[PDB]
Design a protein around this nucleic acid. Structure first.
Lengths: 93, 325, 322, 93, 322, 324
DNA sequence: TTGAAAGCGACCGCCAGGGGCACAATTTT
DNA sequence: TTTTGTGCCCCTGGCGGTCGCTTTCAAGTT
């Protein structure tokens, strides 16, 4: 149920909008790891609230994305070196 | 499932097209605007009375997000809730039964039976010989009025609190609990937990569509909700009351409190932030639901007991409260 | 006694040393400060989406003051409620009255009396019956059951809407009231307008702490908010029906109502945005009736508060008439 | 066995060397999908031939990488819109 | 998992650890398409493309055979990596070549594993002359009596085809090197590119290809391969063609240029190989193993199995299908 | 009779409708565009890493021409072999001689005769024993078994290595030949140098189509190339031993060889790069004192010894080893 | 019409934060 | 003696890869 997603999109004033608006989105559904990267651990119904948001906005003739679905026993073995590994607790400030 | 807490009274929340941005720095920079998601959250708690964008609030309640308000000390003050439930038939029986005490009694005996037991079966967790209480637990059943009972809970509570110092140790002092300001530090910690406990309870009622202001113990004649406290009572002793003893055996032994202008033993900042780690840790617990093998968390059990309670009212089901040995 | 209202999304609310500070600014102006006391207030109202000091809520919520959030239009979004409130006795009287038909009935007779008089007094506004009219009124109060009455609203409505065909003219056609779906343009504006009244009423109820879904006239099913519709009746004839006739003598035309597509009669978004211009214009005026200032928008907030006092204090509910 | 890898590394001429050399590397073990992205389906021995090349090459005090381990039945569920789906065949030209 | 190359105008270079092929399409007349290493276990060259010598030392540090072919598919040679160091094996490989009784008890197995595959193939394709001609072999006591038998069963094997194919193609006879018929060209194609996977398996088992058991090595041809290659000649190249001439590569191709020569068109050679990898991407039960071992691996197995027949003395049960 | 060799990594080979055209770069221009025909070639050698047209291989492999790739130094990496090679007969004689001890023996005596004769012929080169040498060779062919001989290799070596301290001097010390680990610095250079002979020999074998792991003296086991080591012996005394004494009157001293680190004596990388300077220089000589053939370097001389040996096995020829 | 690797040192498609300046009302039972 | 989100620019700036340029070349650790 750990949805990892990517975006790699041109510098068009018509698509550069789509990038910067999409970053404004994914920070709303998940966390940031890399420039073209968000790691979103979340439930399912929250997905269609999301899936319905991207299929609703993109130009597939000019855009590029792929998606990955990761469960825990597939998550634990994501060895990393310069960044910490994912986790999703309640947040405190 | 991933809750949000706020301590800083200088933090502003705005909406950026689908999500939140917190601004902390306070003019040593550009306020350190840190983005945050909402679409994963199910609850919020605000203590330092921070500023919020109104345009943002209306976005949380388009999502089903309660908003809770507290003070630096942790006392409950109020909460802002999203769209409610439309089951009047429920709330009618909630009342049609409130004026027939015969029903009210057959119920409260359960809340307390499931509450005082929660204590004796707790003290055995901690290792206390007798603290004679099951007699008192099963005493209730030989009663037939309310006034007979409210004095009893206060007694078991007084019997529950006099067994307290010996269970803590020598570092702290506790003889009893005061409705006062916390003349004692720990009681302030309880007003903190007992104060913030309404947060998860005040929501579950909003889920079942129940009226918090109509209860069975606290007669709604002091302007205090009662379905909450009548329900909140079953949990004061095992989650917020077990939590404190879980941190005062490892953490915050002392040095992390502050007293000022009243005695008024307030807490220190950055100690509050450790306090909640155990609270959501506690609410990330399983306990397997010792009725069935449900294995529900504490956090959910409240939503459950509330929904369960409506069914006691519409479907006539039994309400076996939570007891753990 | 007074209560607090805020309309401009250009307003900052702060707390200054134990008391409130409102900071306004406007056209050809700036921060137009005004200090404010407490202890006169029992409620606060925010209309647009202004910024607010958190330090103010903790002073209101350590103090027993509900805080409500709306839109400039009056649509309800949410409210901030404190620990302590005197809404339990209210919900009890609200309930104790649902099961005491003598209270429920002596109440329902008022909502209806306050509805028919407004319409007969409406046709006197536009002059159709021309009669001194007597409004039949007092007929309702001197009844002894409900079913005798619930059939009556059906009578006056049939008597009320058949007197429009003569009142509009030939440009439009109206024979009767057709709720969802209308298939007739005019019927849609009422199904539309009767819908937009739910919002300001759906707001007024949350201020009184009432359960909208517990009513006295509209039998409580489907999660149907009868406490709203029970109130909406006294205004159906005065706000949605005066507004419609106020604009259909000037601007709106079938060119602005979309014609039959499959079943429906929706508007163009270029007419929906115009509908409100007269609508909110109306909600910015009234005289009174005892001489006393009141917007229409505000007149409702009172009717609810009066109703709680009818229930909490045992007061009369004398409804609103022209 | 499907090893997906990421790199987002600064524009320092002391690290761009490490990046641009790494881009030349992963093309040796796998395919390219996005700028900071390669998809490497491969065996294990082929991994230590690689992992031992990174631990031997990176300054993690200044670098950032994350890696994900993907089995077939978690691949079947992957989703894309503007790019083709994964494959690892024998090559013909 | 394998790489194929067609154009003799492509130059291959090595990068830090990976390959770059350079295709010259004259819109820029050069196009570097990156290629990975470290995933491959085999290479095949069809044309006569250019190669950097610096690259092989990178490929053969990895266990990568390099195979060379012609547009027609005839095998010419291969460049192999680090050579096995099991001499004691290769002696037994020889100690048996001069003991014909050892050589004899062996060849009877290769043939048993070839003809049974054919009769079990014609029943696979649908037809019924070769199980008599089959275990017959055991009823022999010398070699020359036997080598003529393969030619008979082969002639008996090829003349029984027209009935199974249909009318579009013709087969009366067949010349190894001469492509008098297209299919005869496919044999030099398949029989040529089949050595590629076989010429490697020996290099893993450490066997010397130039010493065989059926084909006497006094012809300058590796008999340990062809003695082995027969068991698969009938199962991969003869079954693959018969599955692709079922709706694929039927005619419109196979240029007749060079009277006595029937070469293919490009993009048909590139289509031909897909089925070759289909077979090499097609597992089977392996009656004695019952569930595993793709075709490509089965060969590497037979060799390792065969060594053990020589150093460990186990049986060599050839590959048999039903 | 000839074959093709290439040393310069600047050479491209193309085909001219039936034949080759060599295109060298040749510092100062494009000197030596010399084309070459076929019908003289049966083997090809690429030494550095020059570029080659595939059109040459596909023309080269339709007729039976091996193609070998090496390093500028001669280290072997791989070779491209065709279908129709006649190395089956070879591997048979290579084996038929392994089990025919008379052939194996009449062979082993030569490798040793070609090693021991080189030692006296070195000590007369490096004046050590005396005026006319001619010792214990012609003594060997007069034997009729192996153990009689393998003791001889051990004898002459023990007789050969104790004569060194007098020949080196006092800066260094040598008691005997020590395999891994080298207890003396010098012994490491031989364990090192004997390795640098393995490469140039390890290439010669793959050209002859021989199985290096099948030998006649060095008993086959552990994956040891015995067909190689049989050959290194005739050169151990002339290539690894002539270079060492050639630099130790001019070059490397304790200043470079690691001081006893864990008991060993390894080299510095700054001496390893210098070691070869005289080493590859050596592989540019050999006037073949018997006029038999002027044109032959040591590096190449081996390719012949192997090719000579194949013919000893395919054609029944003699193997007269290489001496001084 | 000139052989290969690696190794630098510069031109363009991806990335984000940062700084201003036009906006602002919903049902359709 | 203070100020609410939603785009639509430029621009400064930490990424990402290609294209076009002078020196490399040789090895075992028996």
């Amino acid at each position: 149920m750990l949805y990892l997603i990517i975006y790699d999109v041109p510098a068009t004033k018509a698509g550069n909008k789509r990038r910067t608006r999409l970053f404004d989105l994914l920070s709303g559904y998940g966390k940031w790891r890399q420039f073209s990267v968000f790691e979103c651990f979340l439930s399912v119904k929250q997905f269609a609230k999301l899936q319905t948001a991207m299929e609703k906005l993109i130009k597939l003739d000019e855009d590029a994305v792929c998606i990955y679905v990761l469960d825990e026993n597939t998550v634990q073995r994501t060895i990393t070196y310069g960044t910490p590994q994912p986790e999703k607790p309640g947040s405190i400030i | 499932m991933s809750t949000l807490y706020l301590t800083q009274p200088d933090a502003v929340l705005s909406k950026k097209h689908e999500a939140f941005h917190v601004a902390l720095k306070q003019e040593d920079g550009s306020w350190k605007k840190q983005p945050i998601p909402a679409q994963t959250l199910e609850d919020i708690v605000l203590l330092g009375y921070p500023s919020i964008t109104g345009e943002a609030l209306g976005y949380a309640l388009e999502l089903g997000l309660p908003v809770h308000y507290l003070t630096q000390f942790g006392k409950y003050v109020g909460s802002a809730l999203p769209s409610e439930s439309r089951n009047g038939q429920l709330r009618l029986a909630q009342f049609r039964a409130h004026e027939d005490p015969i029903q009210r009694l057959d119920i409260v005996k359960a809340f307390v039976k499931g509450k005082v037991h929660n204590q004796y079966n707790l003290l055995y967790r901690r290792g206390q010989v007798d603290n004679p209480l099951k007699g008192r637990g099963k005493l209730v059943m030989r009663q037939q009025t309310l006034e007979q009972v409210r004095g009893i809970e206060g007694l078991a509570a007084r019997e529950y609190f006099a067994s307290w110092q010996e269970m803590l140790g020598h570092e702290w002092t506790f003889t009893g609990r005061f409705r006062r300001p916390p003349t004692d530090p720990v009681n302030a910690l309880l007003s903190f937990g007992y104060g913030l406990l309404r947060t998860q309870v005040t929501a579950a009622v909003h889920i079942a569509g129940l009226d918090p202001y109509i209860g069975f113990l606290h007669e709604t004649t002091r302007g205090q909700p009662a379905m909450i406290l009548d329900l909140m009572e079953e949990f004061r002793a095992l989650v917020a009351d077990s939590v404190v003893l879980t941190v005062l055996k490892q953490r915050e032994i002392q040095r992390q409190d502050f007293t000022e202008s009243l005695g008024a033993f307030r807490l220190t900042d950055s100690a509050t932030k450790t306090f909640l780690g155990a609270f959501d840790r506690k609410l990330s617990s399983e306990f397997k639901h010792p009725i069935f093998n449900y294995k529900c968390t504490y956090r959910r059990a409240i939503e459950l007991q509330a929904r369960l309670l409506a069914r006691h009212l519409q479907e006539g089901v039994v309400y076996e409260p939570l007891v753990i040995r």
